[PDB]
Design a protein around this ligand. Structure first.
Ligand code: SF4
Ligand code: SF4
Ligand code: SF4
Ligand code: SF4
Lengths: 420, 445
């Protein structure tokens, strides 16, 4: 009974993230995916390329050699091909591995130009003032909508601006997709007294009225993630990124048609793990992920920012911090030794970490370096974590819609009493 | 003791020998898509509640607005308050986010591209060459297992394979010229023939949509709707589960087409376009046709949406299923009695279409689909009362008698609570989700 467990472990109100007076908002360019010190990696031939192009070279090499992963023979070349075809297809509704550019492509900050909004314009739902301002009813409505939109977990928190990127990585508005990767730029995210989210030439402007963040958990497939670092773990990762994108769009449209505004984000705008912890989805862990009672860390996160009045959820403590202090299994299994075996500190290990918050400090350039080597997105830490509990057998074995598991799907049933 | 329900056993018990179960005669011709009630000039226009004659969906918009202002969730159906009325229409409208003009029917436009070459995902992945490398698997048995696994990842609750029967492919599609932007699309619709020719890849010219003669197979997906919400038909929450499933259909088509392309084959998406989904679903064994005209499945009854993808990927066709729907529909008639427009016949099946909207030459129950569409502006939604009242839509129809499975004949003798009630991811129901579990023996024999 997940509803039992979650109420049993509810904390009193208040962000559980411990900060000091040195904490500053973090520039998105500093992540290992984007920072110039980490973006380039060698491929297996010794050629230095953007990390994902070197990883592509390893995927091709593996298919040619009939492998599903590094030193992991597939049943045959056909099976190797199928795993990479499934992975590539999963990313269909995602731009450049994460949808990070705000107010571009799928991540529009206004619904006005969307084909769906245009078709529905005669009804005027996005221009009519709200008919409901009660946060209790709105919380029930928007959480119901979030489940329809594909969230397996949903939570609400007040927006902590500490976790919003100081500056986003984006592209100029008129740059076509084919030039996007070569024309990424940095752009400040600022808060101002304005009626609606708006982007100028100089700034991404979030209204000061943007009170709340809605955080969704999108469950990955257990059998597929257990093949990490091989291709089927890459495929469940990929499919869930497209599920994230559809969730954001559906939910933003619902909120707009209720008379409020909504900012989608997927992997952009801010740090999902921090939002997820403050919204009570789970607890932060040694590997750096939000660990949930239902899925452990084997769940993806996305979030939507809104002025819709809502009731914040309570943070939860089910003992993850104390379990991680003695466990260290992810740190021992990590192929790049990226994950620390030491205690939590306020001091980042490198430019990629945000200093000023008490956390396990991991070396995320070491992690990214393993991705071209293995030809994937690893995930071994997620796979081995106790809270999460060959490839031919996966393809021949159990599956169900969206990779969900009917042995556990009852755990995410929801009634009004657990929504608000 | 009660035998634990087993959807795979049920499908195995009622499997037929190979062969299209649809009975046809010499009158059969391919059907021009413009003839559907949504598009034909005789049915496209409907009065609104003030008597003004408009495109059907604009007259229905007028009724949605009227209901919200009057605090109603449907025709004569009072909501708890105006905010609840508003919330149901906001959910319905949002559900349609990934669907163009109520069904994604224009082929090779917007989401329904016939080639992946211009897609942002294909461009990002181009260095791997998955869409240019020849197939590494040509064995239909392994391909069927691979593609059905992918189909489940892509959100299908049911998946089946049939050889493509061109009788159900539209003779001419409804589409728009390639230079027309979205905001003009509804004013610029045209017809364009769908033809089969000896070409290597699906291709569109100025004059024709060309499907290769190598396009052997159709993959049909069932996308389950939510039972609690459909039971509110014809009110707004039934409209919302309908809408959300159309966007699920779109995601399914794009995901699966990309998988098939990255396996070295071509793939044509369709959603509500290209051809007649119910006929493909019957031939792929998802279910049986019914009095209301829908495909009734063992797992969901007719409370399931359909989409399909066409491909040259070698595959193993599934067997059709006969679990007695025809004989139950012969005596049931509940959808005909409850239909608010009297669109559904109470008579026998014939080969003769009731009107231009029906394709003559196939043995089916002939329904008046102009009457159906006429109730949509009146009710401000997409009705669905027939789906809601069908006994097969109940979750509880199957019983085991110690020897075999059978249908319980006894089954044939508000919105606030929905918003406050049970829900789960994508509106799926964990009490029944085990019914769609799949292993290799389910996917290919
Ligand atoms: S994804 Fe792999 S390399 Fe990265 S931290 Fe986890 S185990 Fe280590
Ligand atoms: S593997 Fe152990 S130490 Fe690492 S995150 Fe999981 S519980 Fe914590
Ligand atoms: S309501 Fe009765 S007659 Fe109509 S489709 Fe269902 S079983 Fe057939
Ligand atoms: S949708 Fe409604 S009007 Fe149309 S056939 Fe079904 S019950 Fe009749």
């Amino acid at each position: 009974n997940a509803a039992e467990i979650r109420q049993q472990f509810a904390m009193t109100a208040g962000s559980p993230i411990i900060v000091n007076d040195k904490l500053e908002r973090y520039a998105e360019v500093r992540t290992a995916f984007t920072h110039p010190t980490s973006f380039f990696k060698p491929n297996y031939k010794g050629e230095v390329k953007p990390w994902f192009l070197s990883a592509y070279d390893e995927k091709v090499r593996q298919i040619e050699n009939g492998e599903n992963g590094p030193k992991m023979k597939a049943k045959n070349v056909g099976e190797a091909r199928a795993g990479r075809a499934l992975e590539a297809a999963g990313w269909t509704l995602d731009i450049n591995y994460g949808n990070i550019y705000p107010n571009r492509f799928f991540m529009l900050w206004s619904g006005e130009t969307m084909t769906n909004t245009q078709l529905w314009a005669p009804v005027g739902l996005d221009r009519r003032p709200p008919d409901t301002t009660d946060p209790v009813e709105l919380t029930n409505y928007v959480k119901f909508a979030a489940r329809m939109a594909g969230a397996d977990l949903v939570g609400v928190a007040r927006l902590n601006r500490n976790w919003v990127y100081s500056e986003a990585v984006t592209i100029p508005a008129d740059v076509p997709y084919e030039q996007s990767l070569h024309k990424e730029i940095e752009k400040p995210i600022v808060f101002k007294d304005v009626p609606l989210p708006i982007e100028t030439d100089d700034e991404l402007i979030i209204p000061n009225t943007c009170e709340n963040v809605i955080v969704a958990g999108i469950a990955m497939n257990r059998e597929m993630m257990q093949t990490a670092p091989n291709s089927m773990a890459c495929a469940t990762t990929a499919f869930c990124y497209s599920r994230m994108c559809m969730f954001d769009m559906w939910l933003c449209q619902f909120i707009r048609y209720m008379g409020y505004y909504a900012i989608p984000s997927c992997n952009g705008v801010g740090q999902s793990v921090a939002f997820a912890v403050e919204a009570g989805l789970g607890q932060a862990s040694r590997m750096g992920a939000c660990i949930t009672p239902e899925f452990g860390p084997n769940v993806r996160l996305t979030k939507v920012f809104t002025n819709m009045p809502l009731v914040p959820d309570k943070p939860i403590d089910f003992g993850v911090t104390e379990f991680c202090e003695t466990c260290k299994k992810c740190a021992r299994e990590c192929p790049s030794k990226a994950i620390t075996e030491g205690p939590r500190t306020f001091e980042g290990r490198s430019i990629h970490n945000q200093s000023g918050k008490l956390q396990w400090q991991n070396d995320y350039n070491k992690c990214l370096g393993y991705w071209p080597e293995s030809g994937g997105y690893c995930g071994v830490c997620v796979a081995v974590c106790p809270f999460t509990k060959n490839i031919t057998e996966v393809w021949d074995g159990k599956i169900n819609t969206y990779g969900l598991d009917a042995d556990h799907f009852r755990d995410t049933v929801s009634f009004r009493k657990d929504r608000v």
